[model samples]
Target: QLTEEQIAEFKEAFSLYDKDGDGTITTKELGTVMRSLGLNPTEAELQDMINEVDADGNGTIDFPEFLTMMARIM
Candidate 1:
């Protein structure tokens, strides 16, 4: 349901959080992104946020999961 531009933007944002260039966003990577945003989320808070959207139970956010989260917020 997303336009091409939106998908492009999401990928760009996803790359920022996918540190190490592994195509997945781990908790540590997300924490780094959050810190960059000037918000210090606690460990529990981070876990909760991931759990809410981590559909595959891999303890990481894949591109699809990240896009889903982005769609919801936008």
Candidate 2:
């Protein structure tokens, strides 16, 4: 399970990446966001990742989805 500090740190990070405060990290900078997390996914593998994971079934990476996504792979 993710600790409070771990979750808090991610919030501190993604909030900066979210930019417009839209609550969702859009496809435009998904790679950079993940790269910052040290995932370092290349363009070749980054493709199609945007349209996936939508756990809540939404097309974008909602806050909860974002955290759980990392948790799943963490």
Q: Which predicted model would earn the best lDDT? A: 1
**Model 1 lDDT tens row, 1-74:** 75999778877888888879999887788898899889999888888889999999988789989888888987
lDDT against the true structure, per candidate, is: 0.87, 0.72
Q: Give the clashing residue pairs of candidate 2, or none.
A: none
Top candidate by TM-score: 1
lDDT by residue for model 2 (1-74), tens: 86999878989866876877888877656877777788877765564575566766566677876676677777
RMSD of 1: 1.8
Error of 2 at 40 (Å): 10
What candidate 1 gets wrong by more than 4 Å, as runs, is: 1-4
TM-score of each: 0.82, 0.59
